[PDB]
Design an enzyme around this catalytic site. Structure first.
Site: not given
Ligand SMILES: Cc1nnn(Cc2cc(Cl)ccc2/C=C/C(=O)N2CCN(Cc3ccc(F)cc3)C[C@H]2C)n1
Ligand code: NA
Ligand SMILES: [Zn+2]
Ligand SMILES: [Zn+2]
Ligand SMILES: *[C@@H]1O[C@H](CO)[C@@H](O[C@@H]2O[C@H](CO)[C@@H](O[C@@H]3O[C@H](CO[C@H]4O[C@H](CO)[C@@H](O)[C@H](O[C@H]5O[C@H](CO)[C@@H](O)[C@H](O)[C@@H]5O[C@H]5O[C@H](CO)[C@@H](O)[C@H](O)[C@@H]5O)[C@@H]4O)[C@@H](O)[C@H](O)[C@@H]3O)[C@H](O)[C@H]2NC(C)=O)[C@H](O)[C@H]1NC(C)=O
Ligand SMILES: *[C@@H]1O[C@H](CO)[C@@H](O)[C@H](O)[C@H]1NC(C)=O
Ligand SMILES: *[C@@H]1O[C@H](CO)[C@@H](O)[C@H](O)[C@H]1NC(C)=O
Ligand SMILES: [Cl-]
Ligand SMILES: [Cl-]
Ligand code: NA
Ligand code: NA
Ligand code: NA
Length: 783
Positions: A120, A158, A179, A260, A665, A671
């Protein structure tokens, strides 16, 4: 209800997520308050730390966080440095880089696993610190494949960026547009804290773990709760890699909240940044030492990737809406490094967006934000087509914040979220492993392209996404995608002289081989939709004229380094000529332009760049005219009369392809007839929302654009066709003080123009199709 009286013995971090009434032992059990009673004792053990010491070698206590026993290699639960401390082995970072020509996997591994190690707020320039601060990361970078930087998506936050990395989609398509977000159909707010984020209704598209599971490939967890230390996340991934063949996942993810966290508190260049950077490097080292211990260090593909960078941003650099607006209590502002505004109460009749934008437009000489209705934002941001994106947006200048009122030493020195072309927002990409290339540097690319590559690395077919499959084939030794040229749907008509001057009542008054060889350098663009169109040849330009739109879809011309600029002679100022190859029924007319008091016209090929007075007459053909507001003409005339010649002088000639875009749109796509909402008064001549240009030249500038033997160089833009120049605060001055700055803000990829026009460019070159796909994803940033 969950029976929490069960045990986690032999189940810590299991992949089969059991449901109520069975209690859980997986990494997410705490978020749903369903862990078994002994989950914290058995699964989150910390006793004796994470490293083996000499005194610990040779036995076993199940209470230990990790083990230094002889049997730990069979159990798959050694501390990552066990072999180094107890068996005289070297750390992975101390071993020389050895090319991995083929995967060297233990028996039972059918394909090379993939580990995505995400960080991050890892700004691209942090990689310049080198092996002094980060030696394990420097080894991955120099030994594998790396880019100098990777472009994130906007907003550079993030949640939009990790989800884009997972899906290959723009945030407007996947739905994670910030976020924080308000969805008016759910009447609910999504936020980093809170339960709303756990509901699947927010998360669109198809993320990599779902693509993998639906195609029979197992995945480890992609969501790590903050109550799991990094060392335990690494040990858990290693433990899963040691599972039986029928249980072991093929794709894993690691996530670090650093750098981060420290970047927000201390700034990206604070001396306090060194320690968190070294700690991330030690975590990478633990992973590589653990993989080496498992004989998987020459088997696994590792991706080290960031979500976004970090900029110096403090309290002292905040603009307040209360300085521009009378009532900030009636509006809600999503604040910080971007602004999103909406009335506090949805559909409040007293919300006057026209009056609010007017009050936020060019009010201070150093105004550190610019307001936009979301359809007016630069198209390269792709940030409009979602009900969670408020109509009113504020693009904040780098190093600044926007807040609603002054009440809302600083507690922070760093922030991110700004326009994704900003240098401080760029992040890192390193690919290391058997499938990635060896000691290879690749040009910077966008994070929307990684999903296709990750699918390629896993043998998966990607779900439909915004990447250009094949554009990153140069990163890989094998598993490249064989891209297929899109089929041309409509074949052009080549009309000859069929009409007479007398056949026209338009209210207007006034060497094909050589044309193609000189002005159509990369073949005719392919029309990828059903339509009727004519190829029209002229001495100075070639065009694909649309019978439906009554204007060219594209106009192609080459301007050499020594071309001369001429003026429109006074007797030709209002000259418009009928084209005897095109029917009066398929032509525009001058009467409609005279009747439309707000709309004027311009030309796609400029009369200013005619090669001779005789050839200048073709520039005045009714088939070369396009509807343009007088405010826009100031921009277009400066571009055509000054900038094209300037670019030809600097790049040793340029090939220009220009034309209209209709995106009423604001979905980033061409379009259909129904969607066009504005026409030139009393006519069927549609009004474009934007005008594009694609400017190509030789990458080796010592060769002229029209005699180039190797790779190409491109820069493009998508200019909003607006009735005013309110976006340019200095537009009362001469065009030399503001036009080029406006064009740079609206820089674009050729791929963005293809989506908006339904055309396919560079179909006839001497370059490989994979190289051409990379050229089509290029964005010239001007940073
Ligand atoms: C936002 C997003 N979109 N996809 N990811 C997955 C992810 C995708 C890739 Cl390519 C590489 C790594 C990761 C891993 C990210 C990760 O571990 N965290 C810690 C938990 N939180 C909080 C949380 C949100 C929704 C939930 F349902 C449960 C907890 C999100 C994130 C900062 N994160
Ligand atoms: Na369009
Ligand atoms: Zn971040
Ligand atoms: Zn940040
Ligand atoms: C970037 O790449 C994406 C993916 O290829 C392109 O987006 C696709 O555009 C096409 C053409 O407009 C859409 O096709 C239509 O789909 C609907 C059915 O849609 C439903 O089913 C599909 C398939 O399972 C699903 O993907 C759709 O998901 C959308 O809606 C969900 C519910 O609201 C939402 O959770 C999800 O995030 C996604 O929202 C986005 O798309 C909708 C439009 O579909 C849009 O209104 C919203 O604001 C978001 O942008 C949905 O459940 C058919 O009825 C139509 O006939 C037609 O086939 C695809 O649905 C759409 N897919 C996605 C994932 O967005 C982008 O055009 C491309 N952008 C550029 C610039 O090239
Ligand atoms: C469910 O929990 C109770 C304790 O609350 C326990 O007695 C019971 O045996 C558990 N269920 C099963 C099937 O073991
Ligand atoms: C705009 O600013 C003027 C002061 O210059 C103020 O009178 C007016 O109320 C403001 N309008 C809005 C909608 O904030
Ligand atoms: Cl989710
Ligand atoms: Cl202005
Ligand atoms: Na975006
Ligand atoms: Na595997
Ligand atoms: Na042609």
């Amino acid at each position: 209800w969950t029976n929490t009286s069960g045990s986690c013995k032999g189940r810590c971090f299991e992949l089969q997520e059991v449901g109520p009434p069975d209690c859980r032992c997986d990494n997410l059990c705490k978020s749903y308050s369903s862990c078994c009673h002994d989950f914290d004792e058995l699964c989150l053990k910390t006793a004796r730390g994470w490293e083996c010491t000499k005194d610990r070698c040779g036995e076993r206590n199940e209470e230990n966080a990790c083990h230094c026993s002889e049997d730990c290699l069979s159990r798959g639960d050694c501390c990552t440095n066990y072999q180094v401390v107890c068996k005289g082995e070297s750390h992975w970072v101390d071993d020389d880089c050895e090319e991995i020509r083929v995967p060297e996997c233990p028996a039972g591994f059918v394909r090379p696993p993939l580990i995505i190690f995400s960080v991050d707020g890892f700004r691209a320039s942090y990689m310049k610190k080198g092996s002094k601060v980060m030696p394990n990361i420097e080894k991955l970078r120099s030994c594998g494949t790396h880019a100098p930087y990777m472009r994130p998506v906007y907003p550079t936050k993030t949640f939009p960026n990790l989800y884009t990395l997972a899906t290959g989609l723009y945030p407007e398509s996947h739905g994670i547009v910030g976020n924080s977000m308000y969805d008016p159909v759910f009447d609910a707010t999504f936020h980093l804290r809170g339960r709303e984020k756990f509901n699947h209704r927010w998360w669109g598209g198809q993320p990599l773990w779902i693509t993998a599971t639906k195609q029979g490939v197992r995945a480890g967890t992609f969501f790590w709760s903050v109550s799991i230390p990094h060392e335990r996340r690494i040990l858990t991934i290693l433990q899963w890699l040691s599972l039986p063949d029928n249980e072991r996942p093929s794709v894993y993810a690691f996530y670090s909240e650093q750098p981060d966290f420290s970047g927000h508190k201390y700034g990206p260049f604070g001396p306090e940044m060194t320690n968190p950077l070294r700690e991330i490097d030690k975590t990478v080292g633990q992973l590589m030492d653990g993989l080496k211990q498992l004989k998987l260090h020459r088997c696994v593909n590792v991706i080290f990737v960031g979500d976004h960078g970090m900029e110096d941003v403090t309290c002292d650099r905040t603009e307040f809406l209360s300085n521009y607006l009378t009532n900030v209590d009636d509006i809600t502002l999503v604040p910080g490094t971007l602004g999103r505004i909406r009335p506090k109460i949805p559909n409040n009749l007293k919300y006057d967006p026209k009056a609010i934008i007017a009050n936020l437009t060019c009010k201070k000489p150093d105004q550190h934000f610019k307001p936009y209705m979301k359809q007016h934002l630069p198209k390269r941001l792709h940030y409009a087509n979602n009900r969670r994106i408020e109509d009113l947006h504020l693009l904040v200048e780098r190093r600044w914040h926007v807040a609603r009122k002054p009440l809302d030493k600083c507690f922070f020195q760093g922030d991110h979220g700004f326009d994704n072309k900003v240098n401080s927002m760029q992040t890192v990409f390193v690919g290391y492993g058997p499938t990635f290339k060896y000691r290879t540097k690749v040009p910077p690319f966008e994070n929307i392209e990684l999903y296709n590559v990750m699918c390629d690395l896993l043998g998966l077919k990607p779900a439909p996404n915004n990447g250009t499959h094949g554009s990153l084939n140069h990163l890989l030794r094998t598993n490249t995608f064989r891209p297929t040229l899109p089929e041309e749907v409509s074949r052009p008509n080549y009309p000859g002289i069929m009409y007479l001057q007398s056949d026209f009542d338009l209210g207007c008054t006034c060497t094909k081989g050589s044309t193609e060889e000189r002005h159509l350098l990369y073949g005719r663009p392919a029309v990828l939709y059903r339509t009727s169109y004519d190829i029209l040849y002229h001495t100075d330009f070639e065009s694909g004229y649309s019978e439906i739109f009554l204007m060219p879809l594209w106009t192609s011309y080459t301007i050499s380094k020594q071309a001369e600029v001429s003026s429109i002679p006074e007797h030709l100022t209002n000259c418009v000529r009928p084209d005897v190859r095109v029917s009066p029924g398929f032509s525009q007319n001058c009467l409609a332009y005279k009747n439309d008091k707000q709309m004027s016209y311009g030309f796609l090929f400029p009369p200013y760049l005619s090669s001779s007075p005789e050839a200048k007459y073709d520039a005045f053909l009714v088939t070369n005219m396009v509807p343009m507001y007088p405010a826009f003409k100031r921009v277009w005339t400066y571009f055509q009369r000054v900038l094209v010649k300037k670019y030809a002088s600097e790049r040793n000639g340029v090939n220009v392809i220009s034309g209209p875009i209709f995106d009423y749109n604001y979905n980033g796509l061409r379009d259909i007839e129904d969607e066009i909402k504005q026409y030139v008064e009393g006519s069927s001549i549609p009004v474009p929302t934007h005008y594009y240009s694609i400017i190509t030249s030789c990458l080796d500038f010592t060769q002229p654009a029209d005699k180039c033997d190797g790779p190409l160089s491109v820069s493009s833009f998508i200019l909003p066709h607006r009735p005013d120049n309110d976006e340019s605060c200095n537009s009362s001055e001469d065009e030399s003080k503001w036009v080029e700055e406006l064009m740079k803000m609206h820089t674009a990829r050729v791929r963005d123009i293809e989506h908006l026009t339904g055309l396919d460019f560079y179909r006839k070159t001497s370059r490989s199709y994979s190289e051409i796909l990379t050229l089509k994803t290029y964005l010239h940033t001007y940073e």
